[PDB]
Structure formats: structure tokens, C-alpha cells
């Protein structure tokens, strides 16, 4: 993550603003539809369209991403509890993080045309990969 | 394997795709986001900056060719393996392109479609297009199997 | 595809493989090195430490089964796709194992063979065994293609 | 990584000693034999068995790995020039680093049976992945 990547990511996620929870819920819905194997991690969830459980989980994921943006230089320390969850208790396969990152990028592209330039796309991809490897670093 | 409704949605969205810019946009974004792919395109001139990549007429001309190949695959969704036999030979035996790059380019194309179509690129449409790009990548990577 | 020299070398090395411990060692090392794979084996008991993993009778028995399946695939090198049809169905449509784990387990098995045979595991023998494990993983991941 | 990973990697690579260049050359030979597509990065190299060019390149890679072990907590700064090389000039596909790491693990397993325990194997895998992602960081 170059400083240019950090500069690009902060502004792009700043223009996300109060739509973060909706974007996270939409990314979760996109991941569940495109990759149904990811649904096995949520057996207790109601995963239909418009689900309030999916809405709340999307808000949580979006808030975690906002915290990661605010703590980009200290992400491993800022995401220690989430890494503990996802690696020890959940032990999610790391390919699922790539799938969710792709769905987040698709949601951002479909909601922020002007912001989703190629350079911002590259920076967001690198930031999401860094978040994913932090969340899987406990393995 | 796409259901008839997925096929109808995919062919309805593809009919409104600008065939002169979408492929070039996808190829340029692939080069910018995964710049090790630039190793396969040294004969395309300047690729130092994202602006130079997206302004490259060779990248635009090649992206047009790749989008045409994707359209050909879309017209033959049940014979993707036979549709991409010679392209698979070219990409594996002649160019030595790793098959993970095919999946990367397919996801970049999905992102480009989402960027261009906005809210009408619904999650079901994206799921159908993910099926399509996965099939195309699998057909292109067959010579490595 | 393996040349006759590669097939002879692979068969000669596999004839000396101890079928009671090699599969268990490979499965245990897969669990230790890629601990997310422990999610598929939560009914095997204690997997909290590497020593507990390598001392698990359930892991040993399942590794015996996996090594038997590998021997079955090795006895039919030209029909790996039909040799692993039911196992592919089980692993894909019933267990939902991501196909990258197949390649991971194959590489772990290659490492275990290198560990056991030392200088006997020459680079040509390793190349032949990499071909074999790649073929096995491809055959097992057919249901996803 | 972890403190335990760092200790295991340090001990295992210390047990390599003066065979580092031989092990690197053998890992390169194994990579060229098992994955011939990696050979396209060395078109000016004599890549036959026993090649002195391969011997020298293996010595260089082994010395780089020794430096990375000596600087395990400052690897990104210690490997800046190598990452610059591999990402800007060479543009190596990242998959190739996984292939070379696997061949290094195979060489270590075939030469150091007592040292290559499952825990040491996991630590070496993690260390090689960290080195690989440092060397592909500039992308
Ligand atoms: C950027 C990627 C991700 C972020 C930021 C993220 C964030 C979070 C957060 C904030 C929570 C709630 C923690 C709490 O309430 O204490 C959570 C839980 C969870 N996550 Fe993720 N996550 C990510 C990726 C994934 C992926 C890819 C999967 C599976 C495919 C996954 C599966 C789960 C599950 C199953 C839970 C538990 C939910 C529940 O039990 O109610 N996560 N994650
Ligand atoms: C994933 C779907 C892909 C499709 C459908 C596709 C399609 C094509 C087509 C139509 C051509 C021109 C063939 C001709 O003119 O005879 C071509 C050539 C080429 N492709 Fe792709 N491509 C794909 C992926 C990739 C990727 C990911 C890379 C590199 C990372 C790549 C590298 C190249 C190169 C360098 C050429 C030039 C070959 C030459 O000039 O002889 N392709 N591809
Ligand atoms: C890569 C080559 C592999 C081979 C040849 C193989 C072989 C086998 C065999 C022979 C069985 C027993 C089937 C039966 O008794 O009917 C089995 C079951 C199983 N496999 Fe694998 N396996 C492979 C990879 C994997 C991987 C990588 C995982 C997980 C990460 C996995 C997870 C399982 C599980 C959980 C079962 C037990 C499920 C059941 O018996 O219903 N396998 N496999
Ligand atoms: C384990 C990770 C690796 C390490 C530690 C490593 C280390 C090195 C070192 C020390 C050099 C010599 C630089 C100098 O002369 O100062 C080098 C050069 C090079 N490496 Fe790597 N390397 C690694 C992985 C790879 C991979 C995976 C490839 C591609 C297959 C690769 C391709 C090259 C090439 C093409 C050169 C230039 C050779 C020459 O012109 O002399 N390296 N690397």
C-alpha cells in the first residue's frame, strides 16, 4: 500500500458516507447470489432479499471497513478482534475474502461512477486485499 | 449453466454494450490493477501511467478484439469449450498466460459492466454474468487441464 | 500426461510408500499448515495443536482413505476423470470444498514424499509427481468446471 | 507472522548453514523441471542440470532469504531493491512465487528431515509467503 493508494482509498470511502451500510448489505447480497457456497457460513441467517439480518451484517461490515480506512497504517492492530473471529472461530476460507472484495468493488462501481476511476479501482483492490490478509493473518 | 431467465437478462444487457470502448476499458483496467499483466503487452508502447494505459490506441484495439471474443462466447454458451479452442491454444502454448489472469480479466469486465450500467446491473444479472465469465475462463484455460 | 520414464519412476517410488502413515501425515500437515481446512473436520476431535493433529486416530484413518484414493488414481492415469467422479461429487456438491485446497493437499503430499525419501526424491521424480497431483486435483474439481 | 513462527524460521534457516546456495540452486532446478513456464523469465540463462548460472542464481536467492531471515521484522524495508526489481523490471506473475516457495519447501524437506516438523513446515510456509508478498508489494 503506497501513500498514493492510501490517499485514493480515504477520499473514495469518504464519498461513500452514510450509504456504507446499504452498500455493505448490497455487496453481501451480490456475494450470496453469485457465489452460493459462501452461504454455508451463515446457516442461522435469513438470507432472502431485503433481509434485516443481512442489512445489519452489512452495516457491521461497512463500519469495520470504515474503521480500517481510519486506521490504514495500523490495520493489523485495529482489526485484531475481527481477525481472531474470522480465523479461529469462523476459519473462513481465504478465497471467500476475494469474492467479497470483488462484490464490494462491483457495488462501488455501480453506485459511484465518477469516483470509480481506474486508479481508484486499483487502490480499492489493494486496500481490500490488505484488509483480507489482515483478517486471515491469524492462521 | 444459465437458466433461460438469466440468459435473457444477459443478452438484453449485452445488446446495449458499447463494443468500441467496453473491451478497451476492461483491458486497460486489467493492466492498471494487475500491472504484472503488462509483461504480455510490451509491444503496445507507453504503459507507465493509468492515463497512458487508458489512452493507448493499441490497448483500445486489442480490447475491442477481446470483447468480440466474449460476444462470440456469449452467442455459443453451450459450446464454450469448442468456441475457445484456438484461443486456448494461443494463450497457453504460445503466450504462457497463467489461467488466474483469465478470472482476473473476467472480474474486471464484470466491474466495467457494473460501472457503465449502474443500478440496472442488478445482483441477479451480475450472478448470471459471473457464470458467463467463469465459463469463458474455464474454456480458455482448458489447454492447461 | 506422463512419459513412460515418469510413469516408471512414479510407480517405483510409490511401491515403497508406507500406506499406513503417509496419508495421515499429509492430512495432518494440511490441517496444521492451512488451519482453515480444520473447518471440514470438526467431527475428528481435538485439532488444537500440531501434536494433537498428528496424533489423531481419525485423521490417521482418513489419511489412509485419501492415500488409497491417490493409489486408485495412480493405477488409472489415463482415466482420472472417471476414477474420481463420485469423489468429485462428494467434495463439491456435498462438502463444498474450494478446489484450491485440492492443490494444497497435493503439494503437501509432494512435500511428505520428499521428507520421507530424501535424495531419492529427485527433481525429475518430483516433476512427475507434480504432474500426477495436478491431474488428481483437476479430476477432483471437475464438478466445479 | 507470530513470535513462534519467527523463532521456528530462524532456527530452521540457521540449520541450513553453508548449504544455502546448493539448496537454492536445487530449488531453482526443481521449479524449472516441475513448472517449465517459469523458464520464460530466464531466456538468457543456461538452464541445464549442473549449470553454473543456475548455481550462482541459487546462491543469490539463498543469500536474499538469509537476509530476510535476519530482518524478519523489517522485511519490507530490507527487500525494497529486490521488490523493485521483481515488480517493476521483471513483472513476475505472483503465482511463480508460490511455485518457488513450494520447491524451496520440497528441497528443505528432502535435505533436513529432523528439522522439517509440521510446525516448522507451517512457519516456513508463512515466512515464504511473507517474502513473496513483499517482493510483489510494488504492484
Ligand atoms: C472485508 C471483509 C470482511 C469484513 C470487514 C468483515 C467484518 C465482519 C464483522 C464486523 C463481523 C461482526 C463481528 C461482531 O459482530 O462482533 C463479521 C462477522 C462474520 N463474518 Fe465477516 N467480514 C469480512 C469477510 C467475511 C467473509 C468473506 C465471510 C464468509 C464468506 C465472513 C463471514 C462472517 C460470519 C459468518 C460472521 C458471523 C456473523 C454472525 O454470527 O452473526 N466475513 N464480519
Ligand atoms: C479472459 C478472457 C480473454 C479473452 C476472451 C481473450 C481474447 C483474445 C483475443 C481475441 C486475442 C486475439 C487473437 C487473434 O487476434 O488471433 C488475444 C490475444 C492476446 N491475449 Fe487474450 N484474451 C483473454 C485473456 C487474456 C489475458 C488475461 C491476457 C494477459 C494477462 C491475455 C494476453 C493476450 C495477448 C498478449 C495477446 C496477443 C497475442 C498476439 O498478438 O499474438 N489475454 N486474446
Ligand atoms: C486432493 C485430493 C483428495 C482426495 C484424493 C480425497 C479423498 C477422499 C476420500 C477417499 C474420502 C472418503 C470418501 C468415502 O469414504 O466415501 C474423502 C472424504 C472427505 N474429504 Fe477428501 N480428498 C481430497 C481432498 C480433500 C480436501 C482438500 C478436503 C478439505 C479441505 C477434503 C475433505 C474431505 C472430508 C471432510 C471428507 C469426509 C466427508 C464424508 O466422508 O462424507 N478432501 N476424501
Ligand atoms: C523466493 C523468492 C525470490 C527471491 C528471494 C529472489 C531473489 C533474487 C535475487 C537475489 C536476484 C538477483 C538480483 C541481483 O542480482 O542483485 C533475483 C533475480 C531474478 N529473479 Fe528472483 N527471487 C525470488 C523469486 C523469483 C521468482 C519466483 C522468479 C520468476 C520465476 C524470479 C525471477 C528472477 C529473475 C528473472 C531475476 C533476474 C535474473 C538475472 O537477470 O540475473 N525470482 N532474484
Curated annotation (Swiss-Prot), chains A, D:
Changing residue 86 to N: In Auckland; unstable. Pfam families: Globin. Changing residue 138 to T: In Tokoname; O(2) affinity up. Changing residue 108 to R: In Suan-Dok; unstable; causes alpha-thalassemia. Changing residue 119 to E: In J-Meerut/J-Birmingham. The keyword Isomerase does not apply. Changing residue 84 to Y: In Atago; O(2) affinity up. The modification Phosphotyrosine is found at residue 23. Changing residue 33 to R: In Queens/Ogi. Changing residue 58 to V: In Tottori; unstable. Gene3D superfamilies: Globins. The modification Phosphoserine is found at residues 2, 34, 48, 101, 123, 130, 137. Changing residue 77 to K: In Stanleyville-2. Changing residue 5 to G: In Swan River. Changing residue 30 to S: In Prato; unstable. Changing residue 96 to K: In Dallas; O(2) affinity up. One of its GO terms (molecular function) is heme binding. Changing residue 53 to R: In Hikoshima/Shimonoseki. Changing residue 112 to H: In Twin Peaks. Signal peptide: none annotated. Changing residue 85 to R: In Moabit; unstable. Belongs to the globin family. It is linked to Heinz body anemias: Form of non-spherocytic hemolytic anemia of Dacie type 1. After splenectomy, which has little benefit, basophilic inclusions called Heinz bodies are demonstrable in the erythrocytes. Before splenectomy, diffuse or punctate basophilia may be evident. Most of these cases are probably instances of hemoglobinopathy. The hemoglobin demonstrates heat lability. Heinz bodies are observed also with the Ivemark syndrome (asplenia with cardiovascular anomalies) and with glutathione peroxidase deficiency. Gives blood its red color. This is Hemoglobin subunit alpha. It comes from Homo sapiens (Human). The gene is HBA1.
UniProtKB/Swiss-Prot annotation, chains B, C:
This is Hemoglobin subunit beta. Changing residue 97 to G: In Nottingham; unstable. Changing residue 59 to A: In Collingwood; unstable. The modification N6-acetyllysine is found at residues 58, 81, 143. Changing residue 142 to D: In Rancho Mirage. Changing residue 145 to P: In York; O(2) affinity up. Belongs to the globin family. Changing residue 96 to Q: In Malmoe; O(2) affinity up. Changing residue 132 to L: In Extredemura. Changing residue 42 to Q: In Hoshida/Chaya. Changing residue 38 to E: In Vaasa; unstable. It holds the Pfam family Globin. Residues 1-145 form the Globin domain. Changing residue 70 to S: In Christchurch; unstable. Changing residue 27 to P: In Genova/Hyogo; unstable.
Amino acid at each position: 500500500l503506497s501513500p498514493a493508494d492510501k490517499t485514493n482509498v480515504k477520499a473514495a470511502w469518504g464519498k461513500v458516507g452514510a450509504h456504507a451500510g446499504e452498500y455493505g448489505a448490497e455487496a453481501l447480497e451480490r456475494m450470496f447470489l453469485s457465489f452460493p457456497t459462501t452461504k454455508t457460513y451463515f446457516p442461522h441467517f435469513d438470507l432472502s432479499h431485503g433481509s434485516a439480518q443481512v442489512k445489519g451484517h452489512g452495516k457491521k461490515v461497512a463500519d469495520a471497513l470504515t474503521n480500517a480506512v481510519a486506521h490504514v497504517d495500523d490495520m493489523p492492530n485495529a482489526l485484531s478482534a475481527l481477525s481472531d473471529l474470522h480465523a479461529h472461530k469462523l476459519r473462513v476460507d481465504p478465497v471467500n475474502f476475494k469474492l467479497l472484495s470483488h462484490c464490494l468493488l462491483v457495488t462501488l462501481a455501480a453506485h459511484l461512477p465518477a469516483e470509480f476511476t481506474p486508479a481508484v479501482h486499483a487502490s480499492l483492490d489493494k486496500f481490500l486485499a490488505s484488509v483480507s490478509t489482515v483478517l486471515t493473518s491469524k492462521y | 449453466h444459465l437458466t433461460p431467465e438469466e440468459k435473457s437478462a444477459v443478452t438484453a444487457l449485452w445488446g446495449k454494450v458499447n463494443v468500441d470502448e467496453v473491451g478497451g476499458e476492461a483491458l486497460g483496467r486489467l493492466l492498471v490493477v494487475y500491472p504484472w499483466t503488462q509483461r504480455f503487452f510490451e509491444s503496445f508502447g507507453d504503459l507507465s501511467t493509468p492515463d497512458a494505459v487508458m489512452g493507448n490506441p493499441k490497448v483500445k484495439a486489442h480490447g475491442k478484439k477481446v470483447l468480440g471474443a466474449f460476444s462470440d462466447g456469449l452467442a455459443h454458451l453451450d459450446n464454450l469449450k469448442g468456441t475457445f479452442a484456438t484461443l486456448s491454444e494461443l494463450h497457453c502454448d504460445k503466450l504462457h498466460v497463467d489461467p488466474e489472469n483469465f478470472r482476473l480479466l473476467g472480474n474486471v469486465l464484470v466491474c466495467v459492466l457494473a460501472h457503465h450500467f449502474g443500478k440496472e446491473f442488478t445482483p441477479p444479472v451480475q450472478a448470471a454474468y459471473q457464470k458467463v465469465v467463469a465459463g469463458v475462463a474455464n474454456a480458455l484455460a482448458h489447454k492447461y487441464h
